[PDB]
User: Fold this.
Amino acid sequence: LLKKHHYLRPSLFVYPEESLVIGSSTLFSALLIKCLEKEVAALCRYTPRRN
DNA sequence: CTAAAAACATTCGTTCACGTGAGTTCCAGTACAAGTCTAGTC
DNA sequence: GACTTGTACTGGAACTCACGTGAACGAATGTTTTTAG
Assistant:
């Protein structure tokens, strides 16, 4: 359902960060593995900065 | 009348200036430890 | 106890990066008004 021609701005890269929350890496890896297996992208609401 | 030359209006891209949040690191400022405190005789 | 010298730690500011907002100029196109043939 993700159309290639539906491009707005350059894409970014999201990587796990264990410095702040301990155990986030395991959940991130599991989510990545299962998304790859099931070929599904996670829909999210993004708020880069306050206000 | 007629077309054409000039003027006017619009949208886009690039440039710049300013403001602001986030990450990195460099340094002034602070804290703390150690030494000094006069020179000589008997 | 007061001064001086030397060493170690540390939070704030400088720098950079990236994004958003607003203002200005020129290119290219389209459209309207006016004037000579």
About this structure: The longest helix of chain A spans residues 24-38.
